[PDB]
Amino acid sequence: APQQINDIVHRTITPLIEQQKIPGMAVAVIYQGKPYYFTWGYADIAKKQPVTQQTLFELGSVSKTFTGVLGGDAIARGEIKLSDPTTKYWPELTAKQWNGITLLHLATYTAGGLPLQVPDEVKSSSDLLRFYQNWQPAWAPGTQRLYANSSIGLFGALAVKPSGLSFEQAMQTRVFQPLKLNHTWINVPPAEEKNYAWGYREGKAVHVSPGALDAEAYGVKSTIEDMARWVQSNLKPLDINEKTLQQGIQLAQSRYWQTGDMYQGLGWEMLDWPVNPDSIINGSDNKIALAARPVKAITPPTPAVRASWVHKTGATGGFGSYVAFIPEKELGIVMLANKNYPNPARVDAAWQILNALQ
Numbered sequence: 001a002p003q004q005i006n007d008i009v010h011r012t013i014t015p016l017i018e019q020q021k022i023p024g025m026a027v028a029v030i031y032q033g034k035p036y037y038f039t040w041g042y043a044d045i046a047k048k049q050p051v052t053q054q055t056l057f058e059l060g061s062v063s064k065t066f067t068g069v070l071g072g073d074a075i076a077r078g079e080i081k082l083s084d085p086t087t088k089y090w091p092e093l094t095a096k097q098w099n100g101i102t103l104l105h106l107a108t109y110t111a112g113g114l115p116l117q118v119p120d121e122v123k124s125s126s127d128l129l130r131f132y133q134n135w136q137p138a139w140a141p142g143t144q145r146l147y148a149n150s151s152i153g154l155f156g157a158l159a160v161k162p163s164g165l166s167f168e169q170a171m172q173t174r175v176f177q178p179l180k181l182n183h184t185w186i187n188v189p190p191a192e193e194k195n196y197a198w199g200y201r202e203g204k205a206v207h208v209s210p211g212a213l214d215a216e217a218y219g220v221k222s223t224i225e226d227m228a229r230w231v232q233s234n235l236k237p238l239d240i241n242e243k244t245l246q247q248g249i250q251l252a253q254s255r256y257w258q259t260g261d262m263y264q265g266l267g268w269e270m271l272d273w274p275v276n277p278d279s280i281i282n283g284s285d286n287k288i289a290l291a292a293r294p295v296k297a298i299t300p301p302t303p304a305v306r307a308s309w310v311h312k313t314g315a316t317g318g319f320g321s322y323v324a325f326i327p328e329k330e331l332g333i334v335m336l337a338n339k340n341y342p343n344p345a346r347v348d349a350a351w352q353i354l355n356a357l358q
C-alpha cells in the first residue's frame with residue numbers, strides 16, 4: 001500500500017487489537033476507489049489458522065445493509081412499495097395494531113416498538129405469525145425509532161415475497177452474484193468451512209446460532225475482499241450495470257428519518273460529512289444506538305447525499321464488524337474481527353483512519 005495508508009492503519013489497529021484483546025482482524029481501506037487489505041492474528045486459535053483475505057467473518061447486523069439494498073432492488077423492480085401496508089404482503093396479519101404499519105416502518109425501525117430480538121421460542125412460520133399478531137406497539141407508527149431485528153427482519157422476508165424466491169435465493173441472484181461477491185454466504189458451505197473464522201466470547205470459540213429471521217437481520221458471513229467490493233458498490237452505484245440494483249443501492253442510502261445528527265436509510269445509517277467524530281463515536285455506543293428516540297419524518301426522503309458519512313456497526317456473540325464510507329471522497333473502510341468489542345472503539349479507529357486519508 002501507499003506508505004500513508006500502511007502507517008495510519010497499523011498505528012491505529014495495532015493498539016486496538018492489544019487493548020481489546022482481539023484474536024484476529026481484517027481491515028480494508030478503499031482509497032480513491034482502490035482497496036488495500038490488512039490482516040492480523042488468528043481465525044482459529046486452537047488450529048493456529050491465521051486471518052487471511054479469504055477468511056470469513058460473521059457480519060452480524062452489517063447484514064442489514066444487504067437486506068436494505070435487496071429491498072431497494074425489489075422496489076426498483078416494481079415488486080413492492082415502501083408505502084404498502086405490511087398486511088398487503090402478509091394478509092394473515094389481521095390484528096388491528098397493524099393498520100397503518102407500512103414496509104417503510106418495518107425497514108426503518110419505526111413501526112412503534114417492535115423488539116430488538118425475535119424470541120428464541122419462535123421457530124416455525126406459525127410461531128412467527130403468532131408473535132407479530134400478539135405484539136403490542138408502545139407508540140403510533142412513524143413516531144419513534146427503536147433499533148430492532150424483528151423490524152427489518154420482517155421487512156426482508158416480506159420484500160422478497162412477490163419475487164417467489166426464498167430470501168437466500170433472492171439475495172444470491174440479485175445482489176451477491178451481480179456484484180461478484182462470490183465468498184459471501186447466508187449459509188457457509190462445507191467447501192468453505194476451512195475459511196470460516198471462529199468467534200471468541202469469553203475465550204470460547206463460538207459461531208452464530210440459527211434463529212427466526214436470522215438471514216434477514218444478522219446472518220451474512222463474508223471476506224474482507226468481498227466487503228471491500230460491497231463498499232465500492234455502495235460508494236459508486238452508477239458503475240453497477242444492473243439497473244434495479246444500482247437503483248436499490250441509491251434507495252438504501254436515502255434519508256427517511258432524522259434523529260439528532262443521524263439519518264435512517266434502509267440498513268445504512270448516514271450523517272452529514274464533515275461529521276463531528278464525537279457524534280458517530282459516542283452515537284455508535286449501544287443504548288444511544290439501541291435507545292428509543294423520537295424521529296422527524298423526512299417528507300419526501302432526501303436522495304442519497306454524496307457528502308455523507310455512511311455506516312453500519314454489527315455484531316454476533318463472537319464477532320464485531322464496522323463499515324463506513326464517504327461517497328464524495330471515494331473513501332471507505334471495513335473492519336472485521338472475531339471478537340465482539342465495543343462499538344465506540346470501532347468507530348474511533350475508523351474515524352482516525354479515514355480522517356487522516358481524507
Ligand SMILES: O=C(O)c1ccc2c(c1)C(=O)N([C@H](Cc1ccc(O)cc1)C(=O)O)C2=O
Nearest residue numbers: 060061062208209218313314315316317318
Ligand atoms: O450471537 C447472536 O446470536 C447475535 C445475533 C444478532 C445480534 C447479536 C448477536 C448482536 O450483538 N447484535 C447487535 C445488536 C444487539 C446488541 C445487544 C444485544 O444484547 C442484542 C443485539 C448488532 O449487531 O446490532 C445483533 O444484532
